[PDB]
């Protein structure tokens, strides 16, 4: 009877996410509370049950938790913040992405923290997810034509963001594997706003952010979902 | 046998370091990962092992460690964002550096956080380091 | 490197931010370097 009293549960206050392509600055970031973290209703407990209904893994995913073990996080599609960035280290990363004859890194860094007085003897649950693109790719020509100072254009993501996350009772959040068992194509897709706003010099002038969203956003490009498994 | 297991090794994959010059705001900040950060080869342990030759404290130092115990942070010379900061604050500033007084103090912080899978109960070590600077000392007129 | 940038009123209009480097940079005023002893 020391060993079986559990149920304490640790729904967690915090989430902090950022997209940061590159070395020279996170280009998006976000932080969210409970005004945007949505405690689930069983009706939604049961309907988590059923949208995924032949996958067994995924049954046994639901039927493992109870019902308030589960959140949906909501991350605002817009920034919170400006980026605020030197110029020069602008034209040294939109100089390698012209002709810096290497690879470049994105870290999609979902990253959360629970509450202390629940109990938890570990705070910073998280883990980075990598995209890598070539010198001088197809999605790094888009971002090539975003990087030239215009306001028209988009992006096209090959699928870094998960959508179910199971927030462990350890040290290292971790996606779903079961709900979504492909593991790199399972993860949704993403698209982006480079915002400039006049007021480089000139694109100092401008003055400029990013907007994440969906492949297709509906009202998404406001508040993108994403539904974590707390433990 | 319980108290002779160890070796699984801690390679911090987080630096954090600003300079804060004043209370107003750190001037100079940046972080970096992995990338900017050089997990050694054993060659150049034979080097850190080389160019420090007769410092007997050194030699026991280099030999202390495992090759993959040691990494090298690098840290970007150029700032990862601007000065952001209010003009009225500028001005308190930079009026002091002028005709306030008393002295000025230089925080460099390099910070670090380890990873938590490999173990290891405490996360953020650090410390900070102070300089000081005169009521209008030769330093303090350079920066004026 | 204190370093502003035309785009105090005026020195708002420039905008500054802070280089670090060596006393003698060769390629460091981009890329210091510093080493640390994990245990």
């Known amino acids: 009877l020391i060993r079986s009293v559990v149920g304490v549960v640790n729904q967690p206050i915090d ?44 049954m046994q995913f639901i039927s493992q938790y109870s019902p308030e073990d589960i959140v949906t996080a909501q991350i605002e599609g817009s920034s919170g913040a400006l980026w605020r960035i030197s110029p020069p280290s602008r ?16 870290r999609f860094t979902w990253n959360f923290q629970r509450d202390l007085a629940k109990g938890g003897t570990v705070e910073y649950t998280n883990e980075k997810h990598t995209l890598e693109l070539a010198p001088n790719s197809t999605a790094r020509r888009q971002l090539a034509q975003l990087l030239e100072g215009r306001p028209d254009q988009s992006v ?9 996350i199971r927030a462990p009772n350890g040290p290292e959040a ?7 068992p492909d593991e790199e194509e399972d993860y949704l897709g993403v698209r982006i706003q480079l915002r400039r706003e006049q007021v480089g010099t000139k694109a100092s002038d401008f003055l400029e952010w990013w907007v994440i969203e969906l492949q297709d ?15």
């Open 174 to 180: 971790n996606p779903v594997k079961q709900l979504q």
């Open 91 to 106: 034209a040294q990363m939109k100089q390698e992405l012209y002709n810096g004859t290497a690879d470049i890194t994105l």
């Open 15 to 58: 989430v902090t996410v950022t997209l940061k392509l590159g070395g020279y600055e996170p280009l998006f970031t976000m932080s969210a509370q409970q005004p945007s973290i949505v405690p689930f209703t069983p009706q939604a407990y049961e309907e988590l049950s059923q949208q995924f209904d032949p996958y067994p893994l995924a």
């Open 156 to 164: 096209v993501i090959p699928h870094l963001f998960p959508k179910y």
């Open 217 to 231: 956003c509906k009202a998404d490009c406001n508040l993108l979902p994403m539904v974590i498994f707390s433990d």
